[PDB]
Each structure stands twice: as structure tokens, then as C-alpha cells.
Write a protein that binds this ligand. Structure first.
Ligand SMILES: OC[C@H]1O[C@@](CO)(O[C@H]2O[C@H](CO)[C@@H](O)[C@H](O)[C@H]2O)[C@@H](O)[C@@H]1O
Ligand SMILES: OC[C@H]1O[C@@](CO)(O[C@H]2O[C@H](CO)[C@@H](O)[C@H](O)[C@H]2O)[C@@H](O)[C@@H]1O
Ligand SMILES: OC[C@H]1O[C@@](CO)(O[C@H]2O[C@H](CO)[C@@H](O)[C@H](O)[C@H]2O)[C@@H](O)[C@@H]1O
Lengths: 238, 283, 253, 19, 283, 238, 283, 238, 19, 19, 19, 19
């Protein structure tokens, strides 16, 4: 018959290939597929929903919930600093986040990102923080002035309550690596006081702010790979 | 379609338009996340953006390239015996099918509440020679749907498969592979469940009450050989033509046991991936 | 005709004698396009105030001279405006114009080979896997070699010329954009060069895209008083400079 | 080359498409 | 196209026309190479040429037939052990991908500054029998993209490849071969680089700062065997659908180490291919 | 199914074959390909650019640069000879040259070739050399007259500076071998004084000439093979 | 075409017409062979023929069915060694290509002065077991065109074939076969030659001066094995798409050595196929 | 994919098969094929050219040239006989002949054949021989009359010089075997004096006749096989 | 015979063409 | 079945034809 | 893909159809 | 499926037909 030549790759097996296989159970008509509210079609979707950020990434706090709140304090001094985290989306505190947890399934990431903060303060309470995105290039800023110099957003706490800070995409390589890499260093984001936290009489003087991160329509990932954030130093029983 | 599908440009992401400054009233950067909804703010909103025509596809970010990848879900083992061949419960394996006997993959699904798909099973038998010559070791992998004679031992009457499926692989001839329709009495495979067997304060509760899909029984047909062996037939699984409903938060605690959520480690404190910081002030 | 005139800033250069001019890879330097781009912010493009004709430190052409190089993204780490915008921004992109002046008389004999080189990964002078040091591939206006002496403790490059410093028989170097300065016809050398790099805008600090080399091929030979010094002067002009990824400010080193 | 479902059943086929 | 492509007559060279004598002013043979440009003089210019219709194609002189040829770039080796199976860092190989662990081929590229292409990897496992019978030695070649659990040892949890690629080859069945898309975050693969990790006077500088593409981990699935072996799985690589930018002078000094240019031999004077002549006068 | 016959060659592996292979990493959309000034498409291009020639292929000179210059001297005698090299493009001094280095990647070569020379002399200086191409057939000429008899070019040093000598293609076999072969002997090229090197007062009396070789549109190669000019008597470390 | 080509009736021979007697002047049977030409006389001329419609094709009498047949032209041999592996000039063969290392086939061509064709080479490796188990003996057949690093010994750097051809065959997988274009700088392959290397009264003269096509180097990749072997990889050759110019008288004296005509046997009188008769009178 | 069935013959190797093979050396454009005077396309051609016949197939003669001439003698008697050979084209003296040498490459032969004779006599000399073809059936004739009875040609030596004798094709089986076979016996051809060899004064009285055999358009062969006429009881050196 | 990209992805295909 | 030069190059093909 | 009774006889064919 | 004389010669073919 057809003079054929069997090619090199032939007979192999790849955990990543698109090929057909005789279906055992011929003539089987599967249960119909009823209608079910909420079906996904793209990881992306999940990536665009803001999940909460562990940031109070500190000691005893960590195994608890607090590990999620950031109390905005006193501050005797002025123009003092709140916190910082680095943008490299696979870096505790980030990592664990619905996003992070994910990204860690792919080798490369890209686009803008969104950080949102909420005031679990009081009503009569007031404040004004300055948040900033310090692109890759230098060291996480020691001072506000130094950080205010780049990308930022002044946040006026008020009747609203949620300020969303965007993290533009600044990079040389259209794409960044999800894995820790000195090169693909995305930078830092930090928060400082613009004014203070003023509270009229008989209101607490510390209060919390929750923070979150969802994606931007910018966003996109690639090169699927097995995760980081989960070592099954098992096995698993029965 | 082709180009778009060959070039893999099916799901493309929008581009980043150009912006100008805004000394205006409506503040898009301000929303109240308590509404439970998600913000809608973009680069163009917050900054003075430029103009970048994108070219990234969200193709590989599809429940089919996220799910559609083969994964070890079971490692059937047979330390043959020649002393007693047959005997009860020997030289033949029986496994009850499930995607959670192996973290890795179990993990991955669990990302969703409900799932559905046609499954492709690939068998990778590996014959370890513990003898000076392995001969010709034929093999039979029979699929036993629920409520069926499961071989008591090696040559029952059930290995006749007069109406069952048995795939045969003989040393040399390639890896056996076969597809299977979505098997569930339900419209979808229950990745989870908050139900029980009954009111019996001793009833079962989990992803088990629901999915009991039968078993796979392995046999090494060939009869008695001289020089021993041990067979290790690996079971890989791929999800083709998949759908998923209601996403869930991933798992961060190493499980134990299947068909259960239970984490509570044997003594050891419950460990998670989160790392500790000295101070929030420096990252 | 050989005469040439060039105007770049608030600056202009003339040359009553020349060997054409050369455009690197036959492409003229220009600004980045929203197609090949990647970043999202609006680049700052100092025009004129930045992409102008900066002249470096001059050098002596010896009968003992061996050769000297300057690395471009770096040679102007001090040249006002451009060289500030460099330090204030993460992403920097720019093309250049190289005016190499070296006169003497028609009674002199000498030959200089001038060349620019995309990604000029130099080799260390010492065997091993130790790569040249930062601080030494980042000389500045001043350039490197001359035929100089230095600590061998430093993860120091190859002062070695004939191997191209990269270990490629110099002479095949003619593959890189170049020209000579044959003191009998020539006066200068003019290289113009676009932005070459697998990325739309790189780090003006970590990465030097263009590397320039000038190498005495036929040794300078007069019969005059060695009171007669024949310098070599390099002048450069960022062209279509574009920056972005604004913020604090790096630090000098 | 494509759409040649060499096998009868539908459960047997390549990874679906995208739309 | 066919004929031209089958006959390989795509890129043909011009012919040599006929000339006559020239007792004329403009002297094409005179140009000033200092302009850095290249002369344009031809046979027809310098002599009294004839007329030759050519028929030589510059097909084989294409970056694709210059590059598109398979070359050993790595030789994975596994001197099995049966004494301790598993153990840490054993019986499983892990290699970090690169085209410069082998002169030959490294050489060839390096002829250009930047390069880009889809790569086809071919695996040639060769099983040396150090025993009286090799059995059935199955194999697993897993590709670990950057930032991923790299097997600590032989059976991690990473050999489940729930979302990774693992190709399997069993003695008999032919050589495994698979293609891979251009993997770089950059528009092209950096054949060279004049950058560093950072300002740290201890930062990295080279073609490494940039290309860290992951690793390939080899395993011999089969379990414990009786009679020993040693496996040598050769890794060949071919460049298909290639492009190249800014040519460079070839290499004449035998390198040492990769991701570096360094030549400086251990003691021996730096040697090059140039030969010595007694006199220029006679060749 | 299709009654097929598996042909002899089947299952083999060739480092030189055009065949497809399942692509691992399905659904991957590679980084776009931005625009980059200067891309090659044919070795040829590189072959047409004149690279410098080591010719002062002599002793101590060789590991240095000089190894590239040819000083035009005194010459008490007249009609004396300068140098010679042989044309067989894979023969030191030629070989190492961008061309040579290359050609050594193919088994066969063909067409014309171009030799260019430049005067790194002075301005007030003057000279006239005679360059010649002595086709294959006899011995590299001992004398000028004998060599002038074949292909040549008188070179008048002047305001110009570069004389380019063409090496026509003379051969029996449309094609020549790149490898040393008595048959495929391309011949010799040599240079002699036509007049002298005259210099008015207080100008040096020796000066150099650089020489080069680029290809002709004639040119073409074939039968790729692994190079000569590079033995990796390594290995290569880490 | 088909029918004519399937039925093999392409080149058919004329038929033998009918004749009558001739009592006439012109005598076709008389010609003068001194003219060096060949007579043109036929059956019909000489006798009173009948009428036979023929049906014999001269298809099989075509330089392509005369030449286009595979023939042993070389028998590469490797008496492995495990004692010293590598070492200089060992366990790896190197042969310089030629059709005259084997009478048979050499014979056949030699029937013509010049020849040209594309060649198909088929490799028949045969592994003789001198041990109690041969394992998995992989193989590499590399083609080294003239002027190339020929492996000094077994693992040079030349077995990387970064730009050379190496075919790989592993025990089981079928015979390797590959075609090759007409390789000559000349329009045709010189079956003979009346030229020399030069005027050197010590120059070479023959079919060698001219055809030096490179070499084929064999290696047995697998590494060190336990139980020895000897490999004998036979090299067959077929001429496809052949042309021939100026036929010659066949050879009747058993040659000796190749690239030469020399017959002069070692002592023995020169022997030829002609047989001796007692008398011409009786056959 | 395509449910295929591998047929019995599969994987074999035949020294006689038409199949394609990946061509190593992709993209190679072979030397053009210049024009060359005299190219063959069919063995036949070679078979139609008369080559000389060894017939003086006798003792000491044989290793020499004479082995080719047949001297026409005295003959005291009259009506005497010259020589004979048998037609079975693979039978010394025939065999060795360009034809024979060939035919011995095929298993079967057919058609008519041509024998030509030439008089290397004198000019003033004269003769008349009778040549005859005695078809298969009986014994090579002892006498002329007996032989004249079948197929023949009287030859008048004269100003011409060459007489060509045709050997019609007489056989039962459309085809004959090239190999010695009692069945496929083609017969005998013999030559005798019709008159004499008369020579006027002072002319030699013995003279030679050369003989040849070329094919007829009748002719055709088949079933290629390896030759008879050449045993390489070698090998062959270097 | 040609252009039968038996495989989906483009990265998998023969050596490109020439133009 | 024929003229299906499964391979690119011409050197690789069946025994030529006759004419 | 179907109805390609690669074999002559009818007894050799796939599982019949349904109607 | 038929009449696909994959081989050139006629001697090589299936069992003839019937008529
Ligand atoms: O039996 C497998 C195990 O996993 C679940 C998810 O909890 O889902 C399924 O996926 C399988 C793939 O191997 C099917 O074989 C299966 O039988 C199906 O339910 C479970 O319900 C099941 O217990
Ligand atoms: O990792 C290989 C090594 O070579 C470079 C060139 O310096 O380029 C590449 O080519 C590879 C082919 O095997 C790709 O696998 C690779 O990962 C890619 O970079 C390097 O950057 C790399 O270090
Ligand atoms: O190298 C083989 C030997 O035979 C000749 C005829 O004398 O012709 C050739 O045929 C070969 C087939 O194997 C080609 O490989 C070959 O290289 C070619 O010349 C000779 O010239 C040659 O010496």
C-alpha cells in the first residue's frame, strides 16, 4: 500500500498533545448538559476579580486574619511612611492572591495591574494617604519626596472609601517572567501619609485599611508550567 | 480562523490608548469595593498613557489549555509472584478512579466547583527486570463500571470482558491510549459536594457520596514466567472538551486523603505558602 | 564633494574634508512606533536640548598608541540633560551621530579604523568565568585603554586589541559599521546609527547598546618635532532620544 | 489537515476549539 | 515556485556579460574604502570578459540552510544506581537549556548578534548494557520552565506534569522529537549582551542576564531493575523558521565556559588558526 | 485501514531533514517581532563585505596587528617584488577572513573575487605598484615580466587611494573545491613595483598598504559541511 | 503512458515484415565495414521472411534498469573494544566513498566513459552478538565532505554535526536509507580520466585526480557495554536518474586496486574468460 | 488518526525497488549539465555495433590477437570446410563480444542476429566462401551439401569485401535463455569454400578474414541478472 | 505533497520557504 | 498513485521515467 | 472519515449502522 | 478504496477481477 515513512517522534507520548483516541464505550449518549449559572471560559476572568492581600506579612500576625489589615496609626512625626510591597506578582505577600496563585502556573506575565485600598476607618474620621509605584530601576524609596517623584496617586479618604491605584506597565521586554528574576524586576509600590488621620472626639485613633489587587484588561499570561506555591510533601491517603 | 487559530490570535487583549490630563469632576479612581463588585479602572484613566497596539492572546488562558494537559493520577504496581499464582487478591490490581489521589492535578481542578469533560487516559507500563530475562509480558487493563464482578483474583471469569472494556498491551507495541465520554448521571462532575449519604449520623459527606465511577483492574495475562518482574503501569489523564462553573480560591494547605478537604496535619502546625516579613516598611 | 556640514542642536560641526558618512545598517534613527512599543506611559522627548552635539575628552595619537574605546549609552552619563534624563528614567532609547576628528598634516602618515558595534560583550583578561566588572565597562567621556596599566584584581576586560577584545580577529571587524581615517585623504569619520536591540527601550544604565572602537592600524609617522601632538577628538549627538519610566533618580558611580 | 474524526464517537476527538 | 523550489533555483546569481576595452576617463577600479563602504567592481569592469549565463543558486546560502541543521548541544548521562534509588539528586538529570555548551553550533550562531527561531529538539537515548539483560527501560524527559519545582530527586511530585511537558520513550519505539515556539520575553534571542544584572559591583554581565529559559529533567521511570545500565540521551537541536540581525566576525579562539566570551587559556598562549609564513614573497 | 508499506529509511533520524513535530506548549503566542535595523537573509551579503587580510603572515608579527599591514619600502633595486599569496580562499593568510572563515563551511566555491588595496602612505608621497593574478597552470612567478604576462592591474597611487583588483574566474570545472586540492588550484596573486615610492623631503620612506578581499556577484558556494578553521579541543566549562 | 508504462511497452521493437525473392542488382548484404560504420541488413533482406508482429520492449534495456539496482560497495566493520574506548583511530570507521572497492558494480559502470546520477544509499547494519546480550546499540553514520574534521577518534567534536549529516539507527527500527544529489564540480562523474595531478614526475594519474567526494564515518554512540559485539554495516548503492556517455568495451581481466586499470596479476598469468578450442572446425 | 494496517513486505529492503528517500544535503543545486557528444539511452545501441569475434579460439593463439583472424588457406581438396561456432550468444568464442559480454547480464534473449565477415586478403586475390546457419534440430554439419540445405549465403569476394550473413530467428519459444540450455539451443553457423582462393603470381596464398557480430532490430533482452563472464576472485586493493 | 500542517501550532512545521 | 514527491529535493524521487 | 472499506469482502467492515 | 496500484509494475497488484 501507501509507501510511508515513519517519522522521528513517532510512537512517543507527550503530556501536551492534541490527538484522537478510540473511545471505549461506543454508542454512549452522555447526560444532557443542563443550564448552570456561572461558567468560566478564561482564567483571565478570575484574574480580574480583586482578591485581598496579606500584607501585614508580619510574624505572629501571619497565621491569623489580621495578616490582611494594615492599621493606619498615630504618627507623631509627619510625612511618615506606611508600608511597601514589591510588584513582582509571585512574591509573598502578593503570590497567595487569586492572581499570584495563578500566575505561578505560567512562566511569563504582562500588562498593567490594579491595586485597590479601602478604609475600614470610621465615618467622622479623615485622612489622606499618598500611594506610589516606583518602577524598576532603583531601590524602594526610603523617603516620600523620593517616591512621589514617580508614579503615584494622592488618596482623599471621604464619603467614597476606595481608591484604586493603577500600576502601568513599564518594562523593556514586552514580557516579564513570573519567576524571581533580577532582570524582570517589576518594582515597588509604597504608601505614605499626605496629611494625617484626624478624628473628632471619642473616636478611635487607629483604624484599618484593607488592600486588594485585580488585573487590568492589559493583562495576559503564557507558557503554562506547574506551580510554585504548593509542594505536596505527602502523599495523600484514603 | 486558521491564521487566527494557527497563529493563536483568537482571544486578543485590547490596546492601551492615549490619554491627556484631566482636571475634572468625575473621579473614576474612587469606587466602593464594598458593593462587592470589581473596579473598572485602567491605565488610560490614572495616567497619561501613550498608544500601544497589543498582540497578546488569552488563548493559553482558557479552561482548555489550563486543564487539557496529561497528569499522573495513579501508579498501578504489581510485584509479581510465581510461587502462588492466582490466590486471592494477587498479581492483579484494582483501582477506583479519581482525580484526587495525586495533588498536582487535583489542585488545578479544585479551582472550580463544577467541571465536565471527556477524558483521555494514557497508560505507561514500565517493566522492571528483576530477572535475567523478562520474556513476553502481555497485559490486560479492564475497566469495571459500578456494580460489576471485580476479579477476586487474577483469572476470574470477569477477564472474559464479554461486555466490558479491556485494552491489551504487549511489550514493544506503544503506549495504550483511549478516550472516554463524560460519565456522570449528573450534568457535570461534582468537584465538591455539601451533601451526605443520608440522615444517619454516620452517613458519608463529600465528593464521594456522588462520584463513584467504577474501577480499573490490571492483569498480566502471560501466565507463569521464570525470571521475576515488577510492573508499574502509570495512569495519565487529560481533559478534552472541558467546561467549568463557579471558580474557587486555590488550595494553600497540603491535603491528605481524598474526597475530603481536611488539612489538619498529623501534629505539625498547619503550614501554608505565606512567607514572613520583618517589617511592612521594607519589601 | 567632500566638505560636510552637520547641525544637531544649538550645535553644528564642519569638515572641509571627509570620507562620505555612514548610516548604520542603512537605517536612519528615529522615534519609536506604537506598534513595536511595549511600555504604556507617554515618553519624554527632549528635543534639541538633549539630542545635540556633545564633545568628549580628547586623546593623543601615539606611535605606541594601541587603541581606545567608549561605550555610548555610558559616554554621556554626564552630558547635561540627556545624561540626567538617563538617571531619572528607567527606559531610555536613542540613536547617535559620531564625529571623529583627527587632523595633522599632509606630511604625516597614519590610519585609524573606527567602528561601532552592537552588543560588544568584552572578554576578561584572566582565564575563567569571571566577567568584566561594571565599573570598568563604564568609563564615561574618558573612554578606556590608551595602552594603560591597572589592577589585575579587578574583573578587568581585555586591553587586547587584535582579538577585538571579544576574541574575533580584528579585521573582520569591518563587518560592523565603520570607516577609517587615512591621514592622507581623510580628516574625520562620521557614523550615524539607529537603535538596535531586541527590546523597544532598554535600561540606559545596565545596558550599553552601542560600543565604539577606534584603532590605530598604520602607526602615526611624521618627521617633525614630537612637540607636534596629534590629538583625536570624539563628538557625539543623541538623536531621537526618548525616555520614560520617570521616578526618583539613580545614583552616580 | 483537520476535522477528520477518524473515530465515530464524539468523546474521541481533539481538544476543542475556541470561540 | 515548485520547479524553482524543487530544482532549487530560487536565489540565482547574475551572469557575466561581455566586455570590450576601455580607454576612458572614469576608473571604476579606484574607490576609497575608507568610506567604510564596499567596492562595487566586477569582472566585466576590470577585464574583457565574455558571456557566461550562470546557474548557481544562493539557496544553500540562506540563514535557513546555514542554520537549519541538527546539532549535539547536550549529552544527558545517567549512571544508574540500584543500591540507593531516589536519594537526593540521583538517577535523574537536570540541564539548563542553552546553545553554547557545545562549540560547533555555538560557533555558527555567534556569527550574528541577534537571532530568532522555532526550535525542534530531537532526543537520541542510547542504553548501554552493563548487565546481562536491560529489561524494559522507560524514560521521562520533562521540560521545566523557569520558576518551577525542579525534582529534588527522582520521584518528586513534579513528575506528575499536571501542567508541564513530559515526553516518554520506551526502548524500541523511535526517537522522540518535538518542536517548540520561540520562547523569549524579548522579540529575539540575545546571542550576546552588554548588560548586567544591576549596579552591584558583583552583578552578572553577559548572555545570561537575559536568557534563562528553564531546564530539562530526565528520569528513568521503570523502577528498580536487576542488571545495571547507563543511559546517554543525546540532545540535538535544529533551527526552523529563523531570522538573523547584525552579523559578526566569526570566532577564532577556542572558548571555555559559556555565556561568556573569555578566551584566555589556562596558561597555554592564546592560539588561533592563523599559520606562519617564512616570507611574504612566496606562498 | 489503509494497507500501507513502511519504507526503508523509516524510523531513522537525519540531522538534515525537513519534517514536522508535535509542538509542546500548544496555544503559545510568541512575543511579537519588533522591527530591528539590519537583518541578514543570505550568507552572501557577508561575503560581499571586504574584511582585512593577514598577509604579513610572518613569524613574530602574526600574533599582533601588523600581521595586517604590508610596508612598501625602499627598494635599491628596481622592478622588485612585494608579496604574494595564493587564491585558494581556504589558505592562510586568506582562510581567517570573513569569507574564508565561511567558505570553510561549504565543500565547494565559485565565481570571481575581489582584492582591494589601500595606501596608508602620506599625501605628498607617491608610488605605482603592479598587482597580478597568475591563473592556475604554473608556478608563482619568480619575476615581474613573467607575471605581467597574465591578468593584472597597474595601480597609480594618488588622490584616490584604493585600487581594487578583480580575480576573474578561470577554471575547467564550473566549480572548485574549498578543501586543499591540487586539481582545484585557483592560482596566485602577487604585487610588484612599477616605479617606486618617491617622497619629497622629510616624509618617511616606508609606508603601509592594507589589503582586503570581498566577493563578486559571481560568487556562490554549496554543499554545507562543518568548518576547518576551528577545533574545539575543549570542552567548554561553566 | 500508464498502460504503456505499467504494461511496460514504452520502447517497442519493430516487427519483421514479409518478403519475396530478389533476383536484383543492389546487394544489401555487401557493405565495407572498414568505413567503421555498422551494417544495416535485416532478416527481410537476406531471406524470405514472413510476418511477425513483435511485442518485446527494450524497457529493461535502459541505462536506468541496467544501472538502477542496489549493490554492496562497502562493508564497514567495527570489532568493538571496551578495554580502551576512544583511543586514536578506534571503534569508529572512516571510508572514502567510491564505486570501485567492489568489482560487480564497478564493472557495470565502467561500460561507459562518463556517467551522472543521483545516488540512493541504503545502510544494512548487522549486529553480531559475541556476548550473552547485546543491549541497545545505537549508531551514527556521518558524512564528511571534503576538507572537514574527520574524527581522530570516536568522540571528537565532529560528531556534533552542527552542519553535517549524521543518520542514526537503533536496533529494531529499520534500515536507514537516504538520497544524495549529484555531487561533482564537473557536469558528470568521471568514470575514467587521462589526466594527472601535475607535471611532477611523481604526480597522480587516474580517476582519482578528479573524484574525491569526502568520507563516511561510522560510530556506535551507546557508550561502553558489557558483553561485546561486532558490527558490520553494509553499504548498498543505487543509481536513480542516470545518464551515460560514450560506451566502452567491458572488462575481462579481474582488477586489483581501484582508481586504476592495472591488471598485471601477482605472478599468475593474465587470465581472461575466453575458452580454448581443439579446432575451429567443430564447435 | 488513519486506522492503518501494515502489510507483509513492510520494513523489508529490495535491491530492486522504486521508492523515495529524504535527500541529505537539502537545498543543493547540482553543477549544470553541459552538452556532451555521445550519450547512450539503451543498451540496445551498443548491441547493434559490431564488435570483433575471437574464433581462432585455438590454443596458443588465444592469448594473442590472431585469436581474431581466420586464415583462408590452400585447400588441395575442394568443397572443404573453414570453421564453425555455435549461435548460443553466451558461448566462447561468442560470449566476450560486446554483445555476449552483455547478454550475460540478462536471463533471456531474442531476435535475429548479424554476422559480418571481411576479407583482409589482397586486391588481385579472389575467392568464394559459402556461410551457413544450421538451425537448432540436428548436429553441426560434417559436410557442405548437408549444411547448404538450410539457411545460407554464398559470398563473392570482390571489390566489396564485406558480406553480412543474417541469422533469422528460429525457435519454438518466443524467447530463449541466455544460459547454456539444451532446449534453447540456437544452432550452428559454419563456413566453407564455394570455389577457392586464386591468386595470380606473386601474391601470398593464405590471407585472413575478420569476423563480426552486431544485433538486428529484431533483438531484445530481459530479466536482468549478474554476469557470468567475470569472477572477481579478488578482492581488490588500494 | 505539501502545506499539510498536520499539527495545529505554527512553531511546528517544516523549514520555512524562501522568497 | 504517483508524482507525490513526498520530499522537497529532486535528487530524492523514484527512478526516472522513459521517453 | 468513513465508508472506506479498505477490504473487498463485506464480512469485513465496521459495526453496522443503525436506522 | 481501490485501483491504487501503489506499485508501478503490473505483476504487483491484487488478485484480479472477475467478469
Ligand atoms: O474518580 C475521580 C475523582 O475525581 C472527581 C473529582 O472529585 O471527578 C472525576 O474525574 C475523573 C477523571 O479521572 C473521572 O474518572 C471521575 O470518575 C470523575 O468524577 C470525582 O468525583 C472522583 O471521585
Ligand atoms: O539556553 C541556550 C543558550 O543559547 C542562547 C544563545 O546564547 O539562545 C537560545 O537558544 C536555545 C536553543 O537550544 C533556546 O533553548 C534558548 O533557551 C535560547 O536563549 C541563550 O540565551 C541561552 O543561554
Ligand atoms: O567514490 C566512488 C568512486 O567511483 C566514481 C567512479 O570512478 O564515481 C562516483 O560514484 C559514487 C557512488 O558511490 C559517488 O559517491 C562518487 O563519490 C562518484 O565519483 C569515482 O570518481 C569515485 O572515486
Amino acid at each position: 500500500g501507501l509507501p510511508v515513512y515513519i517519522t522521528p517522534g513517532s510512537g512517543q507520548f507527550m503530556t501536551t498533545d492534541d490527538m484522537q483516541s478510540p473511545c471505549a464505550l461506543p454508542w454512549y449518549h452522555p447526560t444532557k448538559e443542563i443550564s448552570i449559572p456561572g461558567e468560566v471560559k478564561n482564567l483571565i476572568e478570575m484574574c480580574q476579580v480583586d482578591t485581598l492581600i496579606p500584607v501585614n506579612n508580619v510574624g505572629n500576625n501571619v497565621g491569623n486574619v489580621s495578616m490582611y489589615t494594615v492599621q493606619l496609626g498615630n504618627q507623631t512625626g509627619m510625612a511618615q511612611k506606611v508600608f511597601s510591597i514589591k510588584v513582582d506578582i509571585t512574591s509573598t505577600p502578593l503570590a497567595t492572591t487569586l492572581i499570584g496563585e495563578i500566575a505561578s502556573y505560567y512562566t511569563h506575565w504582562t500588562g498593567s495591574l490594579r491595586f485597590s485600598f479601602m478604609f475600614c476607618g470610621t465615618a467622622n474620621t479623615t485622612l489622606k494617604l499618598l500611594l506610589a509605584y516606583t518602577p524598576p530601576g532603583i531601590d524602594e524609596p526610603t523617603t516620600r519626596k523620593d517616591a512621589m517623584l514617580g508614579t503615584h496617586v494622592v488618596w482623599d479618604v471621604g464619603l467614597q472609601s476606595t481608591i484604586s491605584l493603577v500600576v502601568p506597565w513599564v518594562s523593556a521586554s514586552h514580557f516579564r517572567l513570573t519567576a524571581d528574576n533580577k532582570y524582570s524586576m517589576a518594582g515597588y509600590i509604597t504608601c505614605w501619609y499626605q496629611t494625617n488621620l484626624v478624628v473628632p472626639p471619642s473616636t478611635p485613633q487607629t483604624a484599618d485599611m484593607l488592600c486588594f489587587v485585580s488585573a487590568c484588561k492589559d493583562f495576559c499570561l503564557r507558557m503554562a508550567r506547574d506551580t510554585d506555591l504548593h509542594i505536596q510533601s505527602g502523599p495523600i491517603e484514603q | 480562523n486558521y491564521i487566527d487559530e494557527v497563529l493563536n490570535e483568537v482571544l486578543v487583549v485590547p490596546n492601551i490608548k492615549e490619554s491627556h490630563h484631566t482636571t475634572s469632576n468625575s473621579a473614576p479612581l474612587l469606587d466602593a469595593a464594598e458593593t462587592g463588585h470589581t473596579s473598572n479602572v485602567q491605565p488610560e484613566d490614572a495616567i497619561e498613557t501613550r498608544y500601544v497596539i497589543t498582540s497578546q492572546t488569552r488563548d493559553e488562558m482558557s479552561i482548555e489549555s489550563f486543564l487539557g494537559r496529561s497528569g499522573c493520577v495513579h501508579i498501578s504496581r504489581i510485584k509479581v509472584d510465581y510461587t502462588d499464582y492466582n490466590g486471592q487478591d494477587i498479581n492483579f490490581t484494582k483501582w477506583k478512579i479519581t482525580l484526587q489521589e495525586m495533588a498536582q492535578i487535583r489542585r488545578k481542578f479544585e479551582l472550580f466547583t463544577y467541571v465536565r469533560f471527556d477524558s483521555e487516559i494514557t497508560l505507561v507500563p514500565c517493566i522492571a527486570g528483576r530477572g535475567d530475562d523478562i520474556g513476553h509480558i502481555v497485559m490486560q487493563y479492564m475497566y469495571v463500571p459500578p456494580g460489576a464482578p471485580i476479579p477476586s483474583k487474577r483469572n476470574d471469569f470477569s477477564w472474559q470482558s464479554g461486555t466490558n472494556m479491556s485494552i491489551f498491551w504487549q511489550h514493544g507495541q506503544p503506549f495504550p491510549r483511549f478516550s472516554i465520554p463524560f460519565l456522570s448521571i449528573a450534568s457535570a462532575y461534582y468537584m465538591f459536594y455539601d451533601g451526605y449519604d443520608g440522615d444517619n449520623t454516620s452517613s458519608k459527606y463529600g465528593s464521594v457520596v456522588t462520584n463513584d465511577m467504577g474501577t480499573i483492574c490490571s492483569r498480566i495475562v502471560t501466565e507463569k514466567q521464570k525470571l521475576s518482574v515488577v510492573i508499574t503501569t502509570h495512569i495519565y489523564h487529560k481533559a478534552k472538551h472541558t467546561k467549568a462553573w463557579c471558580p474557587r480560591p486555590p488550595r494553600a494547605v497540603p491535603y491528605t486523603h481524598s474526597h475530603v478537604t481536611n488539612y489538619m496535619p498529623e501534629t505539625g502546625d498547619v503550614t501554608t505558602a505565606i512567607v514572613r516579613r520583618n517589617t511592612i516598611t521594607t519589601a | 564633494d567632500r566638505i560636510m556640514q552637520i547641525t544637531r542642536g544649538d550645535s553644528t560641526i564642519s569638515s572641509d574634508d571627509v570620507a562620505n558618512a555612514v548610516v548604520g545598517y542603512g537605517v536612519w534613527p528615529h522615534y519609536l512606533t506604537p506598534q513595536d512599543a511595549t511600555a504604556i506611559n507617554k515618553p519624554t522627548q527632549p528635543d534639541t536640548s538633549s539630542n545635540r552635539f556633545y564633545t568628549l575628552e580628547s586623546k593623543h595619537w601615539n606611535g605606541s598608541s594601541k587603541g581606545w574605546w567608549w561605550k555610548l549609552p555610558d559616554a554621556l552619563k554626564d552630558m547635561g540633560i540627556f545624561g540626567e534624563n538617563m538617571y531619572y528614567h528607567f527606559l531610555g532609547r536613542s540613536g547617535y551621530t559620531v564625529h571623529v576628528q583627527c587632523n595633522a598634516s599632509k606630511f604625516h602618515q597614519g590610519t585609524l579604523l573606527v567602528a561601532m558595534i552592537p552588543e560588544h560583550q568584552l572578554a576578561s583578561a584572566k582565564h575563567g568565568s569571571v566577567t568584566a566588572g561594571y565599573k570598568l565597562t563604564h568609563p564615561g567621556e574618558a573612554g578606556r585603554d590608551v595602552s594603560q596599566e591597572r589592577d589585575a584584581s579587578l574583573r578587568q576586560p581585555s586591553d587586547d586589541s587584535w582579538l577585538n577584545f571579544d576574541g574575533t580577529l580584528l579585521g573582520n571587524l569591518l563587518i560592523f559599521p565603520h570607516q577609517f581615517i587615512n591621514l592622507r585623504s581623510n580628516n574625520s569619520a562620521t557614523l550615524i546609527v539607529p537603535y538596535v536591540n531586541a527590546v523597544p527601550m532598554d535600561s540606559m544604565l545596565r545596558h550599553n547598546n552601542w560600543c565604539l572602537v577606534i584603532i590605530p592600524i598604520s602607526p602615526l609617522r611624521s618627521e617633525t618635532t614630537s612637540s607636534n601632538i596629534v590629538p583625536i577628538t570624539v563628538s557625539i549627538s543623541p538623536m531621537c532620544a526618548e525616555f520614560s519610566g520617570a521616578r526618583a533618580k539613580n545614583i552616580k558611580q | 489537515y483537520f476535522n477528520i474524526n477518524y473515530f465515530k464517537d464524539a468523546a474521541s476527538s481533539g481538544a476543542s476549539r475556541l470561540d
